[PDB]
Design a protein around this ligand. Structure first.
Ligand SMILES: Nc1ccn([C@@H]2O[C@H](COP(=O)(O)OP(=O)(O)OP(=O)(O)O)[C@@H](O)[C@H]2O)c(=O)n1
Ligand SMILES: Nc1ccn([C@@H]2O[C@H](COP(=O)(O)OP(=O)(O)O)[C@@H](O)[C@H]2O)c(=O)n1
Ligand SMILES: Nc1ccn([C@@H]2O[C@H](COP(=O)(O)OP(=O)(O)O)[C@@H](O)[C@H]2O)c(=O)n1
Ligand SMILES: [Zn+2]
Ligand SMILES: [Zn+2]
Ligand SMILES: [Zn+2]
Lengths: 149, 150, 160
């Protein structure tokens, strides 16, 4: 009965000499995301959306990115919540992400102890507009539903 | 009950020589989007998201299908997976033109296409305060959220 | 009862000299503040839009139009409270609110709990059903240059 929603946002810069790691999947690319972790922009957005839904603050109040997402899952359960579903969008002009998506999903499902059909990941270009459109960064948006058991 | 949430995003460049079609409604304007219906794309993505069926690109690579047909085909696929739609909410970010006059039309299109009571569909509008490409009239963005139940 | 609905909201405002910085109803010590017709509380407007959105009552402009002079310098908390009242009058109880503020500066952490408390008070909710998150934009874009602050919101309600 006690449903809650959460929403998450992250962005990271694309820089030289860094691997591109999105949703736990390493992707061949001439740049990668800049950050104090592996800078996995998708997993940060989902992490914030889960903390948001459980009213536990945000990632920076709490903290590689899969370990952090697993810890997030732990704290959400610690607070009395179970995760019903996650959905997300990755905004990246390049590279193409569609062939890596089911893998990201599998990664996320494992990390949150959820079946595949409750996790979703989607991708969009930014039509060459703004910093996203010139490939200067990548954005992720997330939504999460939990229930307080 | 087994509720699920989905979220959607889209953006399109704003240029002359195309008509402005948002939420299935053609809007008097000197420019249009490169139908490129940013609102219906966002919502479609939100619905596939809630059902966990990937995204609009994965379903529709439909050669001469407008975004309303795509939206209708989206809804049918969501139904087939066991999910009934509960509501949709959305925001259009457009520095111009004025969209308020067109909102009831957009909601009527969407509610028709999703087979929903009008009071379960909402569309909102915002400017970008002259900031960025949106605030300079170089593009328009849509955001959407959908709740479904299986 | 099980008639749940979701809403989402978005707002942005320019950051300029000579205005008070008010986010989540908290006045933040800062050499700049948000520009708008009301007090420009970007976070509260985003949450307000999300609530109207969940209830299918249109948007903040429909209810409290910037073409109306009475909302000049309007207290966005009073606006949030009227929004919640109209949402309740449409038949909805609010279950939770989540949100994100994106700003290069100032540091918002020391003010976040107070924002959450204001919102909880205005929505007549306990603290554990309201969340506020803060993000930098990693130095990217007009947000990264400090030209504005953006807020995003999500709300879940139930028709009683
Ligand atoms: N393309 C647009 C832009 C906005 N609006 C209407 O104008 C209202 C106000 O838009 P906006 O100026 O972006 O809102 P705020 O900036 O939050 O207002 P304020 O400055 O008072 O905070 C919206 O809610 C909407 O009803 C519209 O119909 N079409
Ligand atoms: N203007 C801001 C922005 C973020 N923050 C805090 O900083 C943390 C996140 O910062 P960030 O966006 O740099 O996170 P990363 O993307 O670097 O992981 C959160 O805990 C926020 O509450 C803040 O206090 N003030
Ligand atoms: N980096 C990306 C971007 C998009 N895509 C796919 O491409 C589709 C269309 O994206 P787009 O940005 O061209 O969207 P529209 O131009 O159709 O609005 C998405 O729905 C995804 O399926 C991808 O696989 N990888
Ligand atoms: Zn991050
Ligand atoms: Zn599109
Ligand atoms: Zn505002």
């Amino acid at each position: 009965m006690d449903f809650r929603i959460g929403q998450g946002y992250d962005v990271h810069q694309l820089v030289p000499g860094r691997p591109l790691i999105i949703g736990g999947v390493t992707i061949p690319y001439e740049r990668g995301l800049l950050g104090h972790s592996d800078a996995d922009v998708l997993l940060h957005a989902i992490t914030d959306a889960l903390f948001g839904a459980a009213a536990l603050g945000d990632i920076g109040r709490h903290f590689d990115s899969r370990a952090l997402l697993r810890e997030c899952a732990s704290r959400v359960a610690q607070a009395g919540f179970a995760i019903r579903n996650v959905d997300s969008t990755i905004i990246a002009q390049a590279p193409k992400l569609a062939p890596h998506i089911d893998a990201m999903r599998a990664n996320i499902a494992a990390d949150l102890d959820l079946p595949l059909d409750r996790v979703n990941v989607k991708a969009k270009t930014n039509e060459k507009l703004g910093y996203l459109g010139r490939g200067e960064g990548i954005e992720a948006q997330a939504a999460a539903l939990v229930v307080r058991e």
